[PDB]
Amino acid sequence: MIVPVRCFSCGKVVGDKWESYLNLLQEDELDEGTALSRLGLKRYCCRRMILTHVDLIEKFLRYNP
Amino acid sequence: ASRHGQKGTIGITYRREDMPFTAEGIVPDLIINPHAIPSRMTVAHLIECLLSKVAALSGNEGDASPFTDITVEGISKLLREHGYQSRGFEVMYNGHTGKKLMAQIFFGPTYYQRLRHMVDDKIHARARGPMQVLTRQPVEGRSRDGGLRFGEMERDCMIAHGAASFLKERLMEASDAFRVHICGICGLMTVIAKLN
Amino acid sequence: EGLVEYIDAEEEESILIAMQPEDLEPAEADVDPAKRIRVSHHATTFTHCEIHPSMILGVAASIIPFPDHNQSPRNTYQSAMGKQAMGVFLTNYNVRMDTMANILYYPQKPLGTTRAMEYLKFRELPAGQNAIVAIACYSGY
Amino acid sequence: RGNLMGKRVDFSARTVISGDPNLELDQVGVPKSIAKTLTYPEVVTPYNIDRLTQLVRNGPNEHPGAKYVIRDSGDRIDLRYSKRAGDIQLQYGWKVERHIMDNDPVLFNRQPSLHKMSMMAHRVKVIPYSTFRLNLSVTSPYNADFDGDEMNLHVPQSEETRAELSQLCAVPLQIVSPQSNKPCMGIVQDTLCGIRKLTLRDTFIELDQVLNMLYWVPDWDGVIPTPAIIKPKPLWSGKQILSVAIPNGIHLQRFDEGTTLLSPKDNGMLIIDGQIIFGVVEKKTVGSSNGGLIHVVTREKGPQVCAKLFGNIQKVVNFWLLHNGFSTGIGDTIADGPTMREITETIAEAKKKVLDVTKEAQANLLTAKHGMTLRESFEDNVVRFLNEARDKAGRLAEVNLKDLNNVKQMVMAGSKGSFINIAQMSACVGQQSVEGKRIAFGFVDRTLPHFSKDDYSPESKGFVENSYLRGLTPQEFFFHAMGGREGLIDTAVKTAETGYIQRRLVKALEDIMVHYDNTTRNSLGNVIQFIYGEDGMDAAHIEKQSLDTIGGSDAAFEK
Amino acid sequence: YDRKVPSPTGEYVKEPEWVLETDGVNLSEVMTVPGIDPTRIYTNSFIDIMEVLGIEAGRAALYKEVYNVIASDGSYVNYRHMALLVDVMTTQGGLTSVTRHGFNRSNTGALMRCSFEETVEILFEAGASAELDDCRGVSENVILGQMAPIGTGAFDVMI
Amino acid sequence: SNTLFDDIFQVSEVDPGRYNKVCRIEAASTTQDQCKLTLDINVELFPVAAQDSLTVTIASSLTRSWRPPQAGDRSLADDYDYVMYGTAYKFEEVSKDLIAVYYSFGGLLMRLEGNYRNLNNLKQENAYLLIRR
Amino acid sequence: FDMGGYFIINGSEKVLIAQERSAGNIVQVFKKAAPSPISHVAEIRSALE
Amino acid sequence: ANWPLPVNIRRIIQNAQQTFHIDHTKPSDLTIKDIVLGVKDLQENLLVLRGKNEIIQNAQRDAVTLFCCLLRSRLATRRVLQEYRLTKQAFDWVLSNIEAQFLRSVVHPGEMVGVLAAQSIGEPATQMTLNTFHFAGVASKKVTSGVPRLKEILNVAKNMKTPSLTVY
Amino acid sequence: MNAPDRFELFLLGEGESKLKIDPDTKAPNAVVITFEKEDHTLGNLIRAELLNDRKVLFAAYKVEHPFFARFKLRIQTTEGYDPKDALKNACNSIINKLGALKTNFETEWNLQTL
Amino acid sequence: EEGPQVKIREASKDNVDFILSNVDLAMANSLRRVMIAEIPTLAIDSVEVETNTTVLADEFIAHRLGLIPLQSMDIEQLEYSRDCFCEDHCDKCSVVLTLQAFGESESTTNVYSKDLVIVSNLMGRNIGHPIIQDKEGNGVLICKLRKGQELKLTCVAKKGIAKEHAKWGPAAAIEFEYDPWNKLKHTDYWYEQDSAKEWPQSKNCEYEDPPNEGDPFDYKAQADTFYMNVESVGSIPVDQVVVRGIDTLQKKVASILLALTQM
Amino acid sequence: EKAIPKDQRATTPYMTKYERARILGTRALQISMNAPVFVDLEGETDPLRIAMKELAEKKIPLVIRRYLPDGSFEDWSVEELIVDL
Amino acid sequence: TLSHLRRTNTPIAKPRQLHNTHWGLVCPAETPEGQACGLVKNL
RNA sequence: AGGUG
DNA sequence: CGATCACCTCGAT
Numbered sequence A: 001m002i003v004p005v006r007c008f009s010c011g012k013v014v015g016d017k018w019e020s021y022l023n024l025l026q027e028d029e030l031d032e033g034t035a036l037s038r039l040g041l042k043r044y045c046c047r048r049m050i051l052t053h054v055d056l057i058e059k060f061l062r063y064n065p
Numbered sequence B: 001a002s003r004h005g006q007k008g009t010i011g012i013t014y015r016r017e018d019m020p021f022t023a024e025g026i027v028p029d030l031i032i033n034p035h036a037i038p039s040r041m042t043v044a045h046l047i048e049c050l051l052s053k054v055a056a057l058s059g060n061e062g063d064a065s066p067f068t069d070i071t072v073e074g075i076s077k078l079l080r081e082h083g084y085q086s087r088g089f090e091v092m093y094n095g096h097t098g099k100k101l102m103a104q105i106f107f108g109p110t111y112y113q114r115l116r117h118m119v120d121d122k123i124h125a126r127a128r129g130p131m132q133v134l135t136r137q138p139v140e141g142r143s144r145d146g147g148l149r150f151g152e153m154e155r156d157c158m159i160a161h162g163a164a165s166f167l168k169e170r171l172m173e174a175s176d177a178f179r180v181h182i183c184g185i186c187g188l189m190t191v192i193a194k195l196n
Numbered sequence C: 001e002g003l004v005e006y007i008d009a010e011e012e013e014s015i016l017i018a019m020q021p022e023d024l025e026p027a028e029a030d031v032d033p034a035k036r037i038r039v040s041h042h043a044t045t046f047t048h049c050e051i052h053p054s055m056i057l058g059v060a061a062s063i064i065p066f067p068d069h070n071q072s073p074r075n076t077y078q079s080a081m082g083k084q085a086m087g088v089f090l091t092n093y094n095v096r097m098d099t100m101a102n103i104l105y106y107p108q109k110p111l112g113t114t115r116a117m118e119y120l121k122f123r124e125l126p127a128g129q130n131a132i133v134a135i136a137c138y139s140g141y
Numbered sequence D: 001r002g003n004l005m006g007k008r009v010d011f012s013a014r015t016v017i018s019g020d021p022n023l024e025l026d027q028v029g030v031p032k033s034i035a036k037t038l039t040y041p042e043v044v045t046p047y048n049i050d051r052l053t054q055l056v057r058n059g060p061n062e063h064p065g066a067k068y069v070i071r072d073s074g075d076r077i078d079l080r081y082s083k084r085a086g087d088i089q090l091q092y093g094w095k096v097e098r099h100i101m102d103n104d105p106v107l108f109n110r111q112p113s114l115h116k117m118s119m120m121a122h123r124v125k126v127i128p129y130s131t132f133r134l135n136l137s138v139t140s141p142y143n144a145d146f147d148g149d150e151m152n153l154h155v156p157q158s159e160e161t162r163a164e165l166s167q168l169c170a171v172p173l174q175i176v177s178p179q180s181n182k183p184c185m186g187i188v189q190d191t192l193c194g195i196r197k198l199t200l201r202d203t204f205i206e207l208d209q210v211l212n213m214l215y216w217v218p219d220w221d222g223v224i225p226t227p228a229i230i231k232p233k234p235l236w237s238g239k240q241i242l243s244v245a246i247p248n249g250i251h252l253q254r255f256d257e258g259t260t261l262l263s264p265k266d267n268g269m270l271i272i273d274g275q276i277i278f279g280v281v282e283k284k285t286v287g288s289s290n291g292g293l294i295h296v297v298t299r300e301k302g303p304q305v306c307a308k309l310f311g312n313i314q315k316v317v318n319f320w321l322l323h324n325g326f327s328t329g330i331g332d333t334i335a336d337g338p339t340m341r342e343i344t345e346t347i348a349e350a351k352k353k354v355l356d357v358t359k360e361a362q363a364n365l366l367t368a369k370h371g372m373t374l375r376e377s378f379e380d381n382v383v384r385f386l387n388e389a390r391d392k393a394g395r396l397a398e399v400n401l402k403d404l405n406n407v408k409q410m411v412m413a414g415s416k417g418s419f420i421n422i423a424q425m426s427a428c429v430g431q432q433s434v435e436g437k438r439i440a441f442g443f444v445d446r447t448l449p450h451f452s453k454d455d456y457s458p459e460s461k462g463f464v465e466n467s468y469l470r471g472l473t474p475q476e477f478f479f480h481a482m483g484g485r486e487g488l489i490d491t492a493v494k495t496a497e498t499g500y501i502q503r504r505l506v507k508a509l510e511d512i513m514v515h516y517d518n519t520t521r522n523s524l525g526n527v528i529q530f531i532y533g534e535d536g537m538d539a540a541h542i543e544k545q546s547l548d549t550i551g552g553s554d555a556a557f558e559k
Numbered sequence E: 001y002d003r004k005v006p007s008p009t010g011e012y013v014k015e016p017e018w019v020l021e022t023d024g025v026n027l028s029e030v031m032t033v034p035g036i037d038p039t040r041i042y043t044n045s046f047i048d049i050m051e052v053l054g055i056e057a058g059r060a061a062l063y064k065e066v067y068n069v070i071a072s073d074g075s076y077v078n079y080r081h082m083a084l085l086v087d088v089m090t091t092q093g094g095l096t097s098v099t100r101h102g103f104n105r106s107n108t109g110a111l112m113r114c115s116f117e118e119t120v121e122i123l124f125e126a127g128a129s130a131e132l133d134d135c136r137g138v139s140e141n142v143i144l145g146q147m148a149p150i151g152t153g154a155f156d157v158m159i
Numbered sequence F: 001s002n003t004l005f006d007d008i009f010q011v012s013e014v015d016p017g018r019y020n021k022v023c024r025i026e027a028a029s030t031t032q033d034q035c036k037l038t039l040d041i042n043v044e045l046f047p048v049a050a051q052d053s054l055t056v057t058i059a060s061s062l063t064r065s066w067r068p069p070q071a072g073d074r075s076l077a078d079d080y081d082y083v084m085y086g087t088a089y090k091f092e093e094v095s096k097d098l099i100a101v102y103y104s105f106g107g108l109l110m111r112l113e114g115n116y117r118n119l120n121n122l123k124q125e126n127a128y129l130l131i132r133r
Numbered sequence G: 001f002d003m004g005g006y007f008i009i010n011g012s013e014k015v016l017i018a019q020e021r022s023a024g025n026i027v028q029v030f031k032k033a034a035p036s037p038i039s040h041v042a043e044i045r046s047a048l049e
Numbered sequence H: 001a002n003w004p005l006p007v008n009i010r011r012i013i014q015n016a017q018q019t020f021h022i023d024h025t026k027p028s029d030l031t032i033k034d035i036v037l038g039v040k041d042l043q044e045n046l047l048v049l050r051g052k053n054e055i056i057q058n059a060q061r062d063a064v065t066l067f068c069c070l071l072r073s074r075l076a077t078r079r080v081l082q083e084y085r086l087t088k089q090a091f092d093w094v095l096s097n098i099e100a101q102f103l104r105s106v107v108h109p110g111e112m113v114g115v116l117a118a119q120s121i122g123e124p125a126t127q128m129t130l131n132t133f134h135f136a137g138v139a140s141k142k143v144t145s146g147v148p149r150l151k152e153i154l155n156v157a158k159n160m161k162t163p164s165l166t167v168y
Numbered sequence I: 001m002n003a004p005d006r007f008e009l010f011l012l013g014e015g016e017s018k019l020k021i022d023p024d025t026k027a028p029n030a031v032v033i034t035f036e037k038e039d040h041t042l043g044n045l046i047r048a049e050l051l052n053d054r055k056v057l058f059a060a061y062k063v064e065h066p067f068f069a070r071f072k073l074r075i076q077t078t079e080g081y082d083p084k085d086a087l088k089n090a091c092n093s094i095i096n097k098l099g100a101l102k103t104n105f106e107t108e109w110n111l112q113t114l
Numbered sequence J: 001e002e003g004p005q006v007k008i009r010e011a012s013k014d015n016v017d018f019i020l021s022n023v024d025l026a027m028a029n030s031l032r033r034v035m036i037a038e039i040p041t042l043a044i045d046s047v048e049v050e051t052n053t054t055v056l057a058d059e060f061i062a063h064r065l066g067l068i069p070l071q072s073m074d075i076e077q078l079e080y081s082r083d084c085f086c087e088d089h090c091d092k093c094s095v096v097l098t099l100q101a102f103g104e105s106e107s108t109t110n111v112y113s114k115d116l117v118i119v120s121n122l123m124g125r126n127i128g129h130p131i132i133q134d135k136e137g138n139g140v141l142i143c144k145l146r147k148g149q150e151l152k153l154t155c156v157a158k159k160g161i162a163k164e165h166a167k168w169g170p171a172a173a174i175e176f177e178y179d180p181w182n183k184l185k186h187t188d189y190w191y192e193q194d195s196a197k198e199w200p201q202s203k204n205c206e207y208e209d210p211p212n213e214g215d216p217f218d219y220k221a222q223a224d225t226f227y228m229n230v231e232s233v234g235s236i237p238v239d240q241v242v243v244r245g246i247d248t249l250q251k252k253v254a255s256i257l258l259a260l261t262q263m
Numbered sequence K: 001e002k003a004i005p006k007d008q009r010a011t012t013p014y015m016t017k018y019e020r021a022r023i024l025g026t027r028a029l030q031i032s033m034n035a036p037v038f039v040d041l042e043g044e045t046d047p048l049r050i051a052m053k054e055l056a057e058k059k060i061p062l063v064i065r066r067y068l069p070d071g072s073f074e075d076w077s078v079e080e081l082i083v084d085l
Numbered sequence L: 001t002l003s004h005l006r007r008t009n010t011p012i013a014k015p016r017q018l019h020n021t022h023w024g025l026v027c028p029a030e031t032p033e034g035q036a037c038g039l040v041k042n043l
Numbered sequence M: 001a002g003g004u005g
Numbered sequence N: 001c002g003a004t005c006a007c008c009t010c011g012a013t
């Protein structure tokens, strides 16, 4: 359910990195690890944030009203 | 709780600054005690952590499937390839002083579950309230503002203590207590209460 | 095409099952000291083979990472707990009217998964978060 | 049963319990809301009039306040409503139902209440947050932990009722238990683990920390002890700064194994006046031992003084450890490359001893001893052969574990872990049993349909060759699950039965008490014992003592 | 079996000895067998010890048994506690069980017994036999909502 | 007070029994053919190799709250490199003439045996050990 | 993601819990304890499907 | 030798040694008469039952029989001098300290001794794990233990599961 | 629910004053200052700087419970020296070090390129 | 200059690597702490929800809004609302933001921090401008809208510190290391065979000399020279995180010095 | 009837724990209800602390009726009873 | 939910025990602790 | 019933 | 004629 703003552990803004990550995976066709590092997510607390996120909102938006 | 039979309540909440910290500046979201490990023998918990650390670093999903040839060595080999000490240990500095802890901490990511059973849904206190019609005793349940049961098992501890009056207070002043009239002849509750 | 068959405990009585396709039926003639010790092919008069011994487990247990490295009761205890754990129970949650519904704000797909989780739809509807955790004696709280 | 022997009661609270290292042994951490709910009827006397009047002014929503004012004629003044809630000019003889305040005695409990120690009087400490807070050392008598346990709290309503709690039920009084004639509380977990670490010969602390540690002790005399070292740096040993928590006039001697007054291994224990001379402080000293510091201090210095001792030791050790740190990794289960080889071949030669004994049984060369079956003897042998393997394999691991091994460290302190734990986690799990026999042939002449018929081999009948580190195979896994289940099965069936036993015992002995003639009589005044326990001594005031006229040689008795 | 027996020089010595262990009980007959120590013969059947040797011996074996359950568990309970229980079952002359058949049938107060088991029927026979309840018991005072003659209430306080 | 005992010892063996800062020393006096010493030394602060020749001194001089030395003008009774403060715990006589004394320096143990110890080493919470070269 | 397998009775979702019973028409032999006169018994829980 | 008894004499002695600063190098100011007769007096003062009559007098004598065995073995003339190196002052204090601690050690009338016993047995019974035994590895060591055995005992089991007869 | 307001960590209440000076009973020329609404950030920093003063015999601080922001600082000085002066000088020494640090960082920052 | 010494290794718009030589660990840490928790910033501290026909809950959004970085450059020329004499908020103590979004398009509509609009009187001070570091020019995805979906709300951004709520930290992780050789012997390494082989070398080892094999332990040595890396969220620039850090610390020490004068 | 004379008394000369708790309790109850204090207060306000001092200074005018198992009793004043403990 | 829909109940020699024959049919772990331990099974 | 210890 | 203590929650008639 939607990309968290900021990493719970440290605070680095991650809420602006999602769409960018998705283009890096789909359009650039790179692997998650190189995708995360290209966005500038050096620490593993910041890595799990995006890598471990499930974007349930896309499914929720499918609900008619 | 973790996915390894490790249930535990929040003891206290520390902000980022008071928390122990990595040379990288990483800080735990959670601190679990070493004493929860030896007797419980939940080794997979420790392995999940090693794997999950490697997984977050490399940007891959860790294969924690049972009957596989995934070894602690194999994982350790990959974690070191990421410039970390192979067994999950990390040098950590004290949040209060900045001084390095003499001990290195097994630090890394572990999948933790938020369970039900939350203090606020459990807390109850009663100091006089609703009384059941028949028994004239405090009602039952938090949802009804009930009285905590002081069972016979509890009555026993008080007898053991030799606290004769507290035991009388629990069963009279708090809870029950009623004034009846007795006939000196038959000794029954036949005396008609015509007070005033 | 009869490449797979349905067996109950009654028929199980009369058959010889291999645990793995490979390690249980190739040939015979150094090792990895890290890897666990497995017996052998030995009894070689097989009629069947196990699809996957991970399949001996059900839903709640199929969620545990490496239960094969855990004490048997901890695996039972966890199975009870996972059912008390919050998460996105269903995508339609907003449209339902249930007596109590606990939904996690930012659920996370675990960094440590089981192959069985793919079928259990766990990484699509998770029930927990990947917390950065330190095993340590701190303030003693 | 549910309305006369027991009943639901007013002035009772309950919540989730949590641990507090900054709380006193005899204290109880009560949430503000709870303190604000539960009240004590306090009669207006010139002694309290000023405080009571003010508390009535604070009202029911501000904490050190009250709800209800009881005047003569009977009527209650509800402080939450009432137009005169701000008015109220109190009179002596009126009662003020004031909120529960710091230091009030309260009856604290945890179910099942199978002990007099499961119910104790604690000193109130009104604190924020929703959990009841308690000192880790009061955990054991209640048999509590913080995995989600809930505790009950009761409030005395009379002056005599609160006297009964403080004079009979108080936590410091319950320290030395009559059940086992030893204490029922001691130093546990981080404090037990840290104390060992702090107490080593190697452990040396500098001024900066020394002073902080010294200050942390509240009773501190204010005197900086002369450091044990005044060489190219002043250094205080851990023993030194910890001996500050121990009071004066305290003497303790032990002798473990190699203890020789020169204690080369730093074993045994020697405390003179109140300074630890030698010996690493672990469970034997600081646990709930028969001849422990606690038993000694309660007897020598008093209940309320020994209660202080917990806090003092806690405060130093907790702090020192907060700064030293301690952890447990996956590395603490890893045993040497060469150690694993030996463990592996240990199990391999056990496997052969089993195979040969089997080969022997099959040849009719096996002869069973009088009283048992040819098969009974075989199984009894194999089971023994295989247990020896696990014990030898685990011992090989324990030996390889360094003094820096965090699991070994806990075992050494006595905080958590025993041999088995080391063994099963790092060397070999071992044989699994059900109904006290190795894995049975559930299928016809086989344990699993992966085996052939009549296979009495270790692997087939439930021997777990692997350690939790290596990982269990599907068969091993299932077999361990079968054994594992058996545990949970009786665990359950025990409590339903042990509970009934407890009741019956209690019911049968309810009325047995010591009368004013040292005689032990029932409700009929029938003699049970003429002298209680045959000596007329209270169980808590007793302790194991060596009678020196019984043992020794006739020659040594003479000398 | 291992035995702690004193040596001729004074010190207690570890001298091993042969001991027979039986499946079944016939104490009366086995103790009269020539070649044994009839002073030392034992049985886990405390009831058989009671019938053959007497109530006092039965009491010694009854404790030895209770003790042995606690001991085998690794636990330790002070003598006085099991001593008491054992005496309670013993003082009656025979072996009164810790059940409704045993202690609950005793000459104790009608209200104090009805609190354990057979609740209504205890009060029923109390009515017919026209029982007078002593009110010296804990249970009766607990029911009667009075300060029981327990510790604090085991004496009267006067001016 | 002043010195209670002073001697030059010859180290024979040095052992770190599962310790990294501490070592138990074994030495006999170069003068007296019976006078021995067994003592725990902090080899991190002052190392001791085997066969070393050290000068040992038991004093009782240079009681109230400890004050940091403060070089200002404070001159302590040492031209030494290693100093410890401890307590006497046992005065065991090893028969006839031979007598031993037990000292603990916050748990760093010391046993010294001979005969001429006498009226000097008494039951005192006071005891200073001093080592040089 | 819903899997079904349940019912909806007066708005509430109901799960019928699978009930474990001993199979019928099966012959089974059992030894009988010491005070009993019959040493062994052969049983058949016969029923019509 | 080791048995739970009131008044830890060892500690009392240790306390006297520290308090009075006992010097093992100086001869004691005691007498054989002071020790021998002193201990004999202390014994007469270890009260449990205050009745001046014969029955109660012997009941009292019986109750202190074992503790006096300890007292005598510990406070023997050779031991008081050779071992402890006590002084008349330290010795006199030891005597009065034992008497006081003994009277403190005595059970209090009103003590709910019955409930105490029941709970003292009941609590460790719930703590009992394994209805089986640690003897499970051996064949001729299989006797009913744990909660089932404790159940057999309390119920006064006419037909116990493992009736055994140990012959000497 | 029973959780206190987060501003209570840095905001003083009614009646609550920052410093509370209390003469120590156990030792001469010793004082116990109670810093209100202040954690380890100030405690440890002041305690470490007091240790630099040669005329300071003792300096140790403590956070008696983590729920509350307050901390206790014990200072013992030599005769003639008031511990309130020891605290004063310690505080100034800190300011002077911090002042220097600010300028030094600024001079370096203005050299960098990015 | 005089006391503590600084040597900037690398500097960027978001990070500062530097060496803090001639300083005490107590100061190094107190600075590290105060950087994390006590530098005041500006963050949304009130959400007035006019309309919410969205997938997400009001508070769920309100919470994310608080987490959005806002320009905190001239935060010192803005009052803490508690100190302000106004009833509630004003221009001297707050900044008012507006979020109006509606899914006009068939395709999924996205809501960004760029979509927040300042309504308050700014009075020429660098404040409340949502921090955008995103390449496309729209930082932080607040929400996603379908079609009929609309979100109308109003934000009151206020002055505050992380010590009250984590949203107020100009924060991010601060790297902190001293003595990369354990010459101080401040930590005892856990090993299996070799500590040196099993523990990886820190990049800061290059800036120091190894223990030099058979050398006696330097007991008297104390911790000075600390390797740090301050990362900024964006609200306040890097220099200012450290500069304000030192400043807050001076200010809080000065308050004690001042509290002594009052008594 | 029944009673036992002051001379000839087998009961403990020392006060029991149950005896003092009931005593301090009863005395505290009286103090709380504005009864006169038989000891000088040292800035004391708590009814139990005052009862504790009144016992410490042996000025509690209460007597314990020690019932024996036959029914007979022995009257022991707080003044005579030894409060060792 | 999935777990609930795959539950077994056994009303009323050793039914609570994980039998050999349960292999690959009923879960070796998933069972309630106490009261109905080993009577409530999961597929 | 469904669960918490 | 028995058959662990206490505690929560639900929806039933």
Ligand SMILES: [Mg+2]
Pocket (backbone or CB within 6 Å): D144, D145, D146, D147, D148, D149, M005
């Ligand atoms: Mg628990």
Ligand SMILES: [Zn+2]
Pocket (backbone or CB within 6 Å): A007, A008, A009, A010, A011, A012, A043, A044, A045, A046, A047
């Ligand atoms: Zn991060």
Ligand SMILES: [Zn+2]
Pocket (backbone or CB within 6 Å): B183, B184, B185, B186, B187, B188, B190
């Ligand atoms: Zn009538």
Ligand SMILES: [Zn+2]
Pocket (backbone or CB within 6 Å): J081, J084, J085, J086, J088, J089, J090, J091, J092, J093, J094
């Ligand atoms: Zn304003």
